[PDB]
Design a protein around this ligand. Structure first.
Ligand SMILES: NC(=O)c1ccc[n+]([C@@H]2O[C@H](COP(=O)([O-])OP(=O)(O)OC[C@H]3O[C@@H](n4cnc5c(N)ncnc54)[C@H](O)[C@@H]3O)[C@@H](O)[C@H]2O)c1
Ligand SMILES: Nc1ncnc2c1ncn2[C@@H]1O[C@H](COP(=O)(O)OP(=O)(O)OP(=O)(O)O)[C@@H](O)[C@H]1O
Ligand SMILES: C/C1=C/C(=O)O[C@@H]2C[C@@H](CC[C@H](C)/C=C/C=C/CC1)O[C@@](O)([C@@H]1CSC(=O)N1)C2
Ligand SMILES: [Ca+2]
Lengths: 414, 358
């Protein structure tokens, strides 16, 4: 039997989960207009490509994004999902490739039944203490897969979704399904080895962490930045505004080269030292007021490469693999102050740069929306503090025309 | 009574009198080291002195030094008193508001001009050809912009800027000439190579085909006599150098090239005006002087634009001085005279009067 209020987790109660979601699907059909129902029908017919598009749409030029006819399906489906918000948390289930969480080898083969202690521990060490960014449309289940269910990988994600998460229950032929648009980071709180129908699986107990991510909506990001850093702009000492404007006006190159070469030890320059101190103090004046995603198009030199390095040809998979082996899971540190943007869109000045850092900035980190300073709004810039450290959680790749580019999912850790 | 026109660039100041067809004075935008040295002055004193460029990438970055350049302009180059002439200054596209204010403060408070105005360089260059609608490629010594303009208004959200221009091309030519087996490395040698660049370089219509040609013939070789009589040869460097504008990866830059920034600029404009822009691509500035550049731009934009698009590149012979000429025309216009900011208006309103009126 079923209670008259649903649980937060249907667990193994597949029969009630399916019936409840079937009722929900019927109820939500009352609230979708025909363009939204059209978007859903197209998704049933082309889910992989539509989901793929939804993961990387934001990285192109603003006018390329606007001109893509796939925007219609994306926006209409996203609207359909966004407005059926849950009234309390719910737990969902789905399978991932281990590669999704930067475990770039099999946990066990399809034919194997058990998972070694070795592999279990390797997996734990790889996915612990990391916040993994999730994007795009995804089909999830409200019940745990059991005997006779489809189970494509050895990795089962058991994810708690909070109140106000958008979820779209729907029917596809004989099947009741649940669609979400991922817009958050997940943390793996705990992994456990379980057995389902004679085979060992890893079950990852996962929760989410929200961050503001403006992606290609630079106007919205700019409004947010101006709202939070208009006062900041006015609250600096005259030395701090002076040293800040010097930095932004191109002084950054000397200041940062002094930092990178370890000038404060090898060539102490008290003038520069005072500027570094003032700018740092400026960045601590109004700490980043929410968890925030920022984007940086890195030069290859930040990753020990040049334009003519053979290893910078990411169109060859072996170079992507070599990149991952060197950087994925590592912590990197910038002695320099570091420019980032509120927006993910490509821009003329760095149109050809192949390495994109996508950085999770925890609330209260030092930082400032410099583009609140009336002098230059067209960067949508957030400046991060000198000596910042970033954990590289995961490396993804995508095609920009014929050129393979990398997205480094990173977290600011100090 | 006569107005002054001062077009201040990263490498050169072009200065003269409104009404004239050309600037009376063209001199380097440099200072050496209170009374510190300026126009060529700061190279004949390059010893106890280092030469400094106060305008960087089209933006004034040192106001003390820029006051010296402007002092030099009035008293030494034009031999006029600033108190006796309305003065039209030029500015880069997207010049910060505070920068234009500081230009205005200096003109009235330091030089005590009776009136002044600040005009956008690219808009002046479009105006020089009798146009008020078009997309300008302005490329000088320090910066290159794409500036779309519709009925006299620059469209700031579609302006593209690349910190890649003539001085970068000169430095690149020094490097690749040095790789050929010559040695161009010093300040004086940079001037020589600038001269080689201005005399012998060209943009190839098909770069990969041109490289193949040069590889398998001497047909593209030219000679150049150094000041000491040494004659040198230049080959594929003639076109590899300005190729950098279309392929900024040649100097380690991962930016779009000038054809792509032109396209990006047009694509940021309202769809209704894009054909007007395609049909009125105007080139301005010294770094647009390369033979072959208009044909190559035509070819590259043709490949990006819809197959039905009609594209025209306008590259007048005078385009090294297009900005200055447009300023000379503008300052002379009857309908412009009401637009001058007077000393009286400055006294009444702040430096911020320059937004009211410019
Ligand atoms: N890159 C971006 O995504 C971005 C975002 C917002 C604003 N901006 C704007 O662009 C300009 C800054 O440009 P930038 O960030 O491309 O230049 P940068 O000063 O960060 O980098 C200059 C060069 O140094 C390299 N570099 C930087 N830090 C390094 C390190 N720790 N080790 C080794 N190499 C290192 C870079 O790869 C590049 O080749 C500023 O005007 C800024 O406002 C850029
Ligand atoms: N015939 C030519 N061919 C190629 N380049 C040239 C030619 N004549 C001048 N130049 C280059 O053009 C530049 C000077 O042009 P211009 O005076 O338009 O620039 P600027 O206004 O000083 O700088 P900017 O506009 O970038 O601030 C120099 O780099 C010079 O070498
Ligand atoms: C005919 C001429 C043109 C010119 O454009 O010079 C400008 C100004 C010049 C100043 C430095 C030298 C030493 C002093 C020079 C007096 C020069 C008049 C020279 O520095 C440039 O040469 C730079 C360096 S090399 C290059 O590509 N841009 C641009
Ligand atoms: Ca200029």
């Amino acid at each position: 039997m079923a209670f008259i209020e649903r649980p937060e987790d249907f667990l193994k109660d597949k029969e009630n989960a399916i019936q409840w979601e079937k009722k929900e699907a019927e109820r939500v059909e009352k609230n979708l207009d025909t363009l939204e129902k059209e978007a859903l029908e197209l998704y049933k017919k082309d889910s992989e490509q539509i989901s793929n598009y939804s993961q990387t749409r934001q990285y192109f030029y603003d006018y390329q994004i606007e001109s893509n006819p796939r925007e219609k399906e994306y926006k209409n489906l996203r609207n359909a999902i966004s407005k059926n918000k849950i009234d309390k948390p719910i737990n969902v289930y789905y399978f991932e490739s281990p590669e999704k969480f930067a475990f770039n080898k099999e946990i066990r083969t399809e034919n194997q039944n058990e998972i070694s202690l070795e592999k279990f521990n390797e997996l734990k060490e790889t996915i612990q203490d990391k916040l993994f960014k999730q994007d795009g449309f995804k089909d999830v289940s409200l019940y745990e897969p059991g005997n006779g269910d489809e189970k494509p990988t050895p990795l089962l994600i058991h994810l708690k979704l909070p109140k106000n998460t958008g979820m779209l229950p729907y029917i596809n032929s004989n099947d009741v399904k649940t669609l979400i648009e991922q817009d958050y980071s997940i943390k793996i709180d705990k992994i456990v080895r379980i057995v389902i129908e004679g085979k060992q699986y890893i079950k990852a107990e996962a929760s989410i962490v929200n961050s503001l991510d403006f992606k290609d909506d630079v106007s919205k990001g700019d409004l947010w930045g101006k709202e939070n850093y208009s006062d900041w702009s006015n609250k600096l000492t005259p030395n701090e505004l002076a040293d800040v404007n010097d930095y932004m006006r191109g002084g950054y190159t000397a200041i940062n080269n002094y930092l990178i070469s370890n000038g404060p030890l090898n060539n102490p320059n008290p003038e520069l030292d005072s500027k570094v101190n003032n700018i740092e103090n400026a960045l601590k004046l109004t700490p980043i007021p929410s968890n925030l995603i920022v984007y940086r198009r890195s030069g290859p030199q930040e990753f020990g490469l040049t334009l003519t390095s053979p290893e910078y040809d990411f169109n060859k998979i072996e170079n992507i693999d070599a990149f991952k082996e060197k950087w994925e899971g590592k912590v990197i540190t910038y002695p320099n102050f570091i420019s980032t943007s509120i927006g993910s869109v490509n821009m003329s000045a760095f149109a050809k740069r192949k390495i994109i850092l996508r950085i999770n900035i925890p609330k209260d980190s030092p930082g400032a929306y410099l583009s609140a300073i009336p002098g230059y709004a067209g960067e949508y810039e957030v400046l991060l503090n000198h000596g910042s450290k970033f954990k590289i959680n995961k490396v993804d790749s995508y095609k920009d025309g014929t050129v393979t580019k990398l997205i480094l999912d990173a977290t600011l850790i100090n | 009574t006569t107005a002054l026109v001062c077009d201040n660039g990263s490498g050169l100041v072009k200065a003269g009198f409104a009404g004239d067809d050309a600037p009376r004075a063209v001199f380097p935008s440099i200072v050496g080291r209170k009374d510190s040295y300026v126009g060529d002055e700061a190279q004949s004193k390059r010893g106890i002195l280092t030469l400094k460029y106060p305008i960087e990438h089209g933006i004034i970055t040192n106001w003390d030094d820029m006051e010296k350049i402007w002092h030099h302009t009035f008293y030494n180059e034009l031999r006029v008193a600033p108190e006796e002439h309305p003065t039209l200054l030029t500015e880069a596209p997207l010049n910060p508001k505070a920068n234009r204010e500081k230009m205005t403060q200096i003109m009235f408070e330091t030089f005590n001009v009776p009136a002044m105005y600040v005009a956008i360089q690219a808009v002046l260059s479009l105006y020089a050809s009798g146009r008020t609608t078009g997309i300008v490629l302005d490329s000088g010594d320090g910066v290159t912009h794409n500036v779309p303009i519709y009925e006299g208004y620059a469209l700031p959200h579609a302006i593209m800027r690349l910190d890649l221009a003539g001085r970068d091309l000169t430095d690149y030519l020094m490097k690749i000439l040095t790789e050929r087996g010559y040695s161009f490395v010093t300040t004086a040698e940079r001037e020589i190579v600038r001269d080689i660049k201005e005399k012998l370089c060209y943009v190839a219509l098909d770069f990969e085909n041109e490289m193949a040609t040069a590889a398998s013939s001497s047909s593209l070789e030219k000679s150049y006599e150094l000041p000491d009589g040494q004659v040198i040869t230049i080959g594929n460097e003639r076109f590899r150098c300005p190729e950098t504008l279309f392929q900024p990866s040649f100097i380690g830059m991962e930016s779009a090239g000038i054809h792509e920034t032109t396209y990006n600029s047009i694509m940021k404009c309202d769809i209704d005006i894009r054909k007007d822009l395609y049909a009125n691509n105007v080139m301005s500035g010294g770094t647009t002087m390369y033979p072959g550049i208009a044909d190559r731009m035509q070819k590259e934009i043709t490949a990006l634009a819809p197959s039905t698009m009609k594209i025209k590149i306008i590259a007048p012979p005078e385009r090294k001085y297009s900005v200055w000429i447009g300023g000379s025309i503008l300052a002379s216009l009857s309908t412009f005279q009401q637009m001058w900011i007077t000393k009286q208006e400055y006294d009444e309103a702040g430096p911020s009067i320059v937004h009211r009126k410019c």
